[PDB]
DNA sequence: GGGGGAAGGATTC
DNA sequence: CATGAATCCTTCCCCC
């Protein structure tokens, strides 16, 4: 089995840089602006140019700034990066019939009977880069190797807009000298988890006993690990199917007022059944986000479908329910559809 | 005991 | 300061 990997390189912000070239060269931010105070908000991503200097996903606009005050910053533009998302991914098809799509911008490829060895997927994959890089002016990064997992950590390895390729005989080498925390669906949480067990590398979940495993990060995160330190991990490429659709918006100010919430909820209902579009969906979700950055929810599912006049009705009482079981101000709110028929 | 679904949350990318 | 979705976990609950 052969899988090749591909992520593309500073995704949202590359497609920026594409449609304004003008852009290539200059630290560019691109962000969610919660409209709050000014510049209030978080960054989605940013290209290398602002990386250099500790601008990226995640750190607030504000502090972005501070740092590089006369990068270019843009609102985060969804629709068009998925539907240049969607161009790209269907050009991988033409590798592939057997193809996952990870997110909106990682994909696997199942390429063992399109090949024979790994210098013939090598080759594959420069011939993927250029194809991706001329019809659309985008730079990915390749990584190919046995399974999923190490497919992505060689692409990990080799961004941005590299490729490479993790053989049998390195397979075995990181296995042992790979921290753990670099393993694909190992966040900081659990990597805290596993230094108190000893565990550093792939190879030590092995000296543990998997039942002490199994307690401190469950049977599926520990199954996972023993079969990669193993070399047995071997999860086929599948085809995934939205199972949920929602969205969630942050308010102008904190609140626990039903009827100063409303609207922001309402709101994204109304965005929420346009995504669905034909789809129909049997449960309901409100998520909200407390002024400490807490997360609740409270959900009903129903044994038929929900119209939209049902959920507008149905997620003002989860709402009432929320605030008569949290104390606490809401900074964001939503909700969340799915158990489509 | 144990299947099976539902609800609220924990983690990750 | 702090902006969508999957998978997995724990606890209930109904029930033969
Ligand atoms: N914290 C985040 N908030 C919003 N969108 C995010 C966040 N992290 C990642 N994304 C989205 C937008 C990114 O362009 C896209 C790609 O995944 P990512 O892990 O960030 O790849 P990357 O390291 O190659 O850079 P880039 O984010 O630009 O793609 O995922
Ligand atoms: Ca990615
Ligand atoms: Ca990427
Ligand atoms: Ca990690």
């Not at 922001?264 to 789809?279: M, P, Q």
Request: charged share 35%; glycine share 4%; net charge positive.
């Amino acid at each position: 089995m052969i899988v090749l990997f591909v992520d593309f390189d500073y995704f949202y912000a590359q497609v920026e840089e594409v449609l304004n070239p003008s852009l290539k060269g200059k630290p560019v931010v691109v962000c969610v602006f919660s409209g709050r105070f000014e510049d209030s908000g978080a960054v989605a991503t940013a290209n290398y140019e602002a990386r250099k200097f500790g601008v990226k996903a995640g750190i607030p606009i504000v502090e972005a700034k501070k740092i590089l005050p006369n990068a270019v910053y843009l609102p985060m533009r969804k629709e068009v990066y998925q539907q240049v998302s969607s161009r790209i991914m269907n050009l991988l098809r033409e590798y592939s019939e057997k193809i996952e799509i990870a997110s909106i911008d990682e994909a696997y490829l199942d390429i063992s009977d399109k090949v024979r060895d790994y210098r013939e997927a090598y080759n594959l994959g420069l011939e993927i880069k250029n194809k991706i890089l001329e019809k659309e002016k985008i730079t990915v990064t390749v990584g190919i190797s046995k399974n999923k997992v190490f497919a992505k950590i060689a692409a990990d390895m080799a961004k941005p807009n590299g490729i490479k390729v993790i053989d049998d005989e390195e397979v075995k080498r990181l296995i042992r000298e790979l921290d753990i925390a670099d393993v694909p669906g190992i966040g900081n949480i659990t990597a805290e988890k596993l230094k108190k067990l000893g565990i550093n590398k792939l190879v030590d979940t092995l000296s543990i006993e998997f039942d002490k495993l199994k307690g401190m990060i469950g049977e599926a995160k520990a199954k996972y690990l023993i079969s990669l330190a193993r070399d047995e991990y071997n999860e086929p490429i599948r085809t995934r199917v939205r199972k949920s659709i929602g969205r969630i918006v942050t308010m102008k100010r904190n609140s626990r007022n039903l009827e100063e919430i409303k609207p922001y909820l309402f709101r994204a209902i109304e965005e929420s059944y346009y995504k669905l579009d034909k789809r129909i969906p049997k449960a309901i979700h409100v998520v909200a986000v407390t002024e400490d950055l807490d997360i609740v929810s409270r959900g009903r599912t129903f044994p038929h479908g929900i119209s939209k006049e049902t959920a507008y009705s149905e997620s003002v009482k989860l709402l009432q329910k929320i605030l008569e079981e949290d104390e606490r101000k809401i900074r964001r709110i939503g909700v969340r559809f799915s158990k489509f028929i």
